[PDB]
Design a protein around this nucleic acid. Structure first.
Lengths: 263, 182, 131
RNA sequence: UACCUGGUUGAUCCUGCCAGUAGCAUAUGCUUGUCUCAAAGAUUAAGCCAUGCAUGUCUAAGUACGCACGGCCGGUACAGUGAAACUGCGAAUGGCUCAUUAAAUCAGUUAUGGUUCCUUUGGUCGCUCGCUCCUCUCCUACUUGGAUAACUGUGGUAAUUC
RNA sequence: CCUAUCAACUUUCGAUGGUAGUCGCCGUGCCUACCAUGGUGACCACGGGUGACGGGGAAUCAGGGUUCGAUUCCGGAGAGGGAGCCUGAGAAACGGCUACCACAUCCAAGGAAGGCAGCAGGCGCGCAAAUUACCCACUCCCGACCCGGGGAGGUAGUGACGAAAAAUAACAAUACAGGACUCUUUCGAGGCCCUGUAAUUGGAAUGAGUCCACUUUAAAUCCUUUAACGAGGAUCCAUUGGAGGGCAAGUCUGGUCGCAGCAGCCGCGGUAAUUCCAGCUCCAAUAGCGUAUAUUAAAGUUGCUGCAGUUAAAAAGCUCGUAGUUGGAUCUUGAGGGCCCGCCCCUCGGCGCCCCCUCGAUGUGUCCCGCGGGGCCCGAAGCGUUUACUUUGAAAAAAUUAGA
């Protein structure tokens, strides 16, 4: 048996890149149902008390949430295990600090403060662009936000500045060659780079040849490429650890050099 | 969770000449038993196998480079190996002795308050030294380079200075109860 | 004796309204002056009184002469009471949890199942056996 | 650590197994001072079971006519708090054990354009487009109809979460 | 996974397929009509067996391999056995229901209520496995919710599975046995380092115990922290096997005398027993060691890497021969720099040709051109007909594991 879906998830069976411990706790937070899939999510708790360390109990975490000092995507949340994802902005209204989640090329979720100007909008790639019922068109973004009456020239894999004050499309950026991308998941996790060429194969799975800033060339599936804006025109800054790609030797040299040299 | 042995048992249980060899190492370096010698035998064999693997990997290969350098750096930190040599070929040439010599016990002999490889072990186990401001109670230890610059008396042995325990006071009362007659 | 409280990893925590810090106490040879002493000592540093200061953790360091613990100082007693884990309150008495305790509640719960309505009846049914 | 050594005979060289030997995993014998870590009713009866207990749940906020408690504050419906009960949700999850099953289960790789999905998250919330306005007469919109719990009282049962 | 002392199998109660329908959350012989006669096997089907849950993983191996996987995580499956069902998005649910069957319970004899392969505990079983404890504070789950509930889970107790650290004394003195050094012809003596063995010591030390205090923690325990205490000795006092061979250590001493026993194996013991039975001494490992047993290594005694078959265990009486395995030869690709590079016996890019906004002669538009979108079409390239192989990428659980 198995008479229905689990409402629990054990630790030491949760995805590595959330940066939880091994067996020292027997249960992981587990994301709630929401706009993103649970593998790629980062439960609010892990950000709040394991990275920003504002709680040393679970009792505190609930009490923090009930204050409602936390908006996520401009809207007022109170969920203890909110399923935030890629380019989801967290807005602390008590301190005026806006943090966004973007991958390190190490593969660890970055604590990446952004200005409240850049926390007005986020760039969301279209997943489907849908001729809906009664001939009204809609675009649907990756984060499951359906915006009606969208711009009437858009096509698949375009990005779309969604605004979080007022909802809706606030222009768009057209998908073209050489656009900035962050390649997410896989062995190419958290790398940034242009395009170069998108190879098309009829039937399932189309691969996109990416060249990164360093000049290392690799392919991944189209699914694993996320378009984050226009070529050589960032809209949010690079995170820690380069965010490009760095070798284990170089990384060791940074780790030893910076440590016992601060303070 | 998970656990592992730190020693190894050889395939021949009686091998007289070897047993004598092992007894000699125990004498020279003040050890408890054969298990102490086996503990080094286990570590050394793994180091040689590590080295040998690297050496059969292709040159200018990330894995060989990164792990090579790491193995070398570790062995130089503890002062077993010298960095004027510093490759795989030389690591193979190391033997049991070279490890034993860099232990805490053999430094406590070489400088400080031991008189023998006997005395030293008992001094460490009875907490007569700090390595820095930190007591060490384990004689089989292996100190690093710059940790041999800070071996000195403890403040919790009361000769060499320190708060009276009940062993200094015991001697005081062999003069005030042994010779005080009460 | 000859302590000094040295504060590593200081945090201004504006959203739980408290100064959150590690407490590193050097000692001459004996690890740990009292928890109450530490709250008093700390109290005149940040000038908040020891009654809005909680201190917890603590673990003596071999061969003496140090103890690392943890402290929190609440700007007001209201703030303390509002983030409030019961164990923290318990640690130096000023509130402790339920003392019913436990199997009394379970017995009561099993009594309620039997009948519909009549609250008081089930209390009295749980109360006669002591056994 | 890539190993062997003992036994066929008068003696010898082979074929050969046997025994020794180290690992390990339980059992068992004997002994055992201090420090840390912890596997542990699988084997054999997925045998049988006393007793105790392992899932319950309320926000200013669906619904208070408690025998409540406390108020001055009372009418339009009036209370602050609230046992209970109704309502809604969990109860399918959790935990346990490996008996069953031999391309079955299952693993990895693929699919649903063959289909269902509470909830959460995002959109979707006036209208009969006027029955060519019964919906200006279909004129109940300043809002329709009538019954159960808890409760109160009488009770039945050798024995029931009756 | 094993099996041929299982070689033909599947449908009369559909076996495979066509067609059409009933039905189902939905595909489908799912079911049914009609209509076909299929489907599968020596490349092991079919049948039988199975302490046969699967994976991630675990143990040992030079390498090759061999063995293990109920068991901290993931998937599936079942909750005494069967069958049926309700609620709900999701259940054919035993801390839901209903029937029967096997089990058990209460009974006033009419009836009634039940399922520890949940947590503890008990009985039975065995070679084998712990508290009828405390708590929701942690870690998370559920709810109307910060607030409550949790044998989820945490906590202690039991715990030589097994792992980690390594104590039970260390240093002088003297009395001796000794060697570098010195003196002496040598003998001999002095001499430093000590090792043991006396006689006892001398300071000097430390927790095993004991214990205010501080600490721990849900509250506690223990640890890690410490006033006051705790080592001259036959002690604050270590064990378990061996000493004929393999096999480390008794040409032991007493006792027995083929007796009792010893002895995995080889063999001892029948009177001068280095194997026994005691004592003594010594050896090996050392808070551990012995023993039984499964499995692994050694074992090239299962031989892929890497076996043997004249005579040691082993070529069918002989030949034909199908599956199966294996198989002859034979096709073209000069420069630059001190090898390296492209070549030879139309969806793109683009030599060009023709088109359009045109790019310079020009500013619906040419004659340098397809350069940006085109078409056609060469060096290039699908080129000619396929691959296996090999090579680079992706997709590729965490823990484990190597390892920073």
């Amino acid at each position: 048996m198995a008479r229905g879906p689990k409402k629990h998830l054990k630790r030491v069976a949760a995805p590595k890149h959330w940066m939880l411990d091994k067996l020292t706790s027997v249960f992981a937070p587990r994301p709630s149902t929401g706009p993103h899939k649970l593998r790629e999510c980062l439960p609010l708790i892990i950000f709040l008390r394991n990275k920003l360390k504002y709680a040393l109990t679970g009792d505190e975490v609930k009490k923090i949430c009930m204050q409602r000092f936390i908006k996520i995507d401009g809207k007022v949340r109170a969920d203890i295990t909110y399923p935030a994802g890629f380019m989801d902005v967290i807005s602390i209204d008590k301190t005026g600090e806006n943090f966004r989640l973007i991958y390190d090329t190490k593969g660890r979720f970055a604590v990446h403060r952004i200005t409240p100007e850049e926390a007005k909008y986020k760039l969301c790639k279209v997943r489907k662009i849908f001729v809906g019922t009664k001939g009204i068109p809609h675009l649907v973004t990756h984060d499951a936000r359906t915006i009606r009456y969208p711009d009437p020239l858009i096509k698949m894999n375009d990005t779309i500045q969604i605004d979080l004050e007022t909802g809706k499309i606030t222009d768009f950026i057209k998908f073209d060659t050489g656009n900035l991308c962050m390649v997410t998941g896989g062995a190419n996790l958290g790398r940034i780079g242009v395009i170069t060429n998108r190879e098309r194969h009829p039937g399932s799975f189309d691969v996109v040849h990416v060249k990164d800033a360093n000049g290392n060339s690799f392919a991944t599936r189209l699914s694993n490429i996320f378009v984050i804006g226009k070529g050589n025109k960032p809209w949010i800054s690079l995170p820690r650890g380069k965010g490009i790609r760095l070798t284990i030797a170089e990384e060791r040299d940074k780790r030893l050099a910076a440590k016992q040299s601060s303070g | 969770w998970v656990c592992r042995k730190t020693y190894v048992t050889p395939r021949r249980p009686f091998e007289k000449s070897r047993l004598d060899q092992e007894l000699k190492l125990i004498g020279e370096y003040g050890l408890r038993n054969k298990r102490e010698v086996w503990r080094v035998k286990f570590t050394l064999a793994k180091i040689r196998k590590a080295a040998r693997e690297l050496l059969t990997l292709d040159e200018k290969d990330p894995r060989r480079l990164f792990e090579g350098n790491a193995l070398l750096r570790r062995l130089v930190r503890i002062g077993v190996l010298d960095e004027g040599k510093m490759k795989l070929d030389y690591i193979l040439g190391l033997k049991i002795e070279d490890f034993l010599e860099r232990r805490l016990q053999t430094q406590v002999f070489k400088l400080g308050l031991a008189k023998s490889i006997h005395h030293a072990r008992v001094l460490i186990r009875q907490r007569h030294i700090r390595v820095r401001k930190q007591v060490v109670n384990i004689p089989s230890f292996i100190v690093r380079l710059d940790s041999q610059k800070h071996i000195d008396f403890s403040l919790r042995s009361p000769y060499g200075g320190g708060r009276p325990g009940r062993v200094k006071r015991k001697n005081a009362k062999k003069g005030q109860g042994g010779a005080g007659a009460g | 004796d000859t302590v000094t409280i040295r504060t590593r990893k200081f945090m201004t925590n504006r959203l739980l309204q408290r100064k959150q810090m590690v407490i590193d106490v050097l000692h001459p040879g004996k690890a740990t002056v009292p928890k109450t002493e530490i709250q008093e000592k700390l109290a005149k540093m940040y000038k908040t009184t020891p009654d809005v200061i909680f201190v917890f953790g603590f673990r003596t360091h071999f061969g003496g002469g140090k103890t690392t613990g943890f402290g929190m100082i609440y700007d007001s007693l209201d703030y303390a009471k509002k983030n409030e884990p019961k164990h923290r309150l318990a640690r130096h008495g000023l509130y402790e949890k339920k003392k019913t305790s436990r199997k009394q509640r379970k017995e009561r719960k099993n009594r309620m199942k039997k009948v519909r309505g009549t609250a008081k009846a089930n209390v009295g049914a749980g109360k006669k056996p002591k056994e």
